[PDB]
């Protein structure tokens, strides 16, 4: 409880979403660079994380890093690039955690821009050295499963440094590993289910954009 660092994973490909755009006869745009709220998806995500009151925000870049970094160029973030770039989400998070000063890390997906600052703040507040907190698929409370969950989450930096090097690369298998090991996982109910939407398909982006257009 001395310092909270955010790590935003903004380094991955999003081939499915780009193909979706091509299949609509649109020019594909990488998910993080799609327009949202007068800015880009990635700027929206970072703004939410900073608005959650973290002491610093690390952003991990890789895929199309030049463009993602240019999108963020006005923002108060510390950028670290994956090199080599072809690493999975867990490795991107690890690179970010390596760059973070804090004892608690708030891990967020760059492509999940509808999480509110208030939800992120609640997630960060429930983490400690031995407790992982996470955006829940349903109601708040202790979790005995990791169905339908992944990001954002918060955890002790030492705990993340022990778990992130393990597994296949995806976050969800690590959460199941943690539960098997007896790690306490606390689910925080989303303000709105839109907060759970990561941009995998173009339809996910349109769903988020529609929410943003409604709420200004």
* Count of residues that bind Cl ion according to CB under 5 A: 9
Among the residue ranges 13-21, 40-48, 139-147, 176-184, the one whose residues contact Na ion (CB under 5 A): 13-21
Outline where the chain has alpha helix (H). Answer: 15-23, 41-51, 65-71, 89-99, 117-126, 157-163, 171-180, 202-215
Sign, Cα dihedral of 134, 211, 77, 202: positive
Which secondary structure element, helix H or strand E, spans residue 109, and what is its range? strand 104-109
CB of 68 to Na ion, least distance (A): 23
36 binds Cl ion (CB under 5 A): yes
Please, which of residues 132-171 interact with Cl ion by CB under 5 A?
Answer: 156
Instruction: Rule CB under 5 A: say whether 206 interacts with Na ion.
Output: no
Helices (H) and strands (E) in the chain, counts: 8, 10
For the segment 23-62, give every residue that binds Na ion (CB under 5 A): 23-24
Residues 102-131 that bind Cl ion (CB under 5 A): 103, 129
Residue 101 sits in the site that holds Cl ion (CB under 5 A): no
Q: Give the one residue of 52, 65, 80, 175 binding Cl ion; rule: CB under 5 A.
A: 80
Residue nearest to Cl ion (CB): 129
For the CB of residue 23, give the shortest distance to Na ion in the complex, in Å: 4
Listing DSSP states for 156-193 in one string gives EHHHHHHHTTSSSS-HHHHHHHHHHTT-EEEEEE-SSG
Binding site for Na ion (CB under 5 A): 20, 23-24
């Amino acid at each position: 409880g001395n310092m909270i660092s955010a790590v935003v994973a903004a380094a991955g490909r999003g081939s499915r979403m780009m193909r979706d755009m091509a299949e609509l006869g649109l020019e594909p745009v990488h998910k993080l660079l799609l327009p949202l709220n007068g800015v880009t998806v990635i700027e929206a995500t970072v703004k939410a994380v900073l608005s959650a009151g973290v002491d610093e925000c690390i952003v991990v870049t890789g895929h199309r890093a030049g463009e993602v970094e240019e999108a963020l160029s006005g923002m108060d973030v510390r950028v670290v690039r994956n090199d080599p770039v072809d690493v999975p989400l867990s490795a991107s998070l690890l690179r970010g955690v390596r760059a973070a000063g804090g004892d608690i890390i708030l891990c967020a997906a760059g492509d999940q821009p509808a999480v509110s600052p208030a939800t992120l703040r609640r997630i960060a507040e429930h983490a400690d050295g031995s407790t992982v907190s996470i955006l829940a698929r349903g109601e708040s409370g202790w979790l005995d499963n990791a169905r339908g969950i992944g990001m954002p989450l918060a955890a002790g930096a030492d705990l993340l440094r022990d778990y992130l090097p393990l597994g296949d690369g995806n976050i969800n298998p690590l959460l199941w590993m943690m539960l098997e090991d007896g790690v306490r996982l606390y689910g925080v109910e989303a303000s709105r289910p839109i907060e759970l939407v990561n941009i995998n398909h173009y339809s996910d982006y349109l769903r988020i954009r529609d929410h943003f257009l409604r709420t200004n």
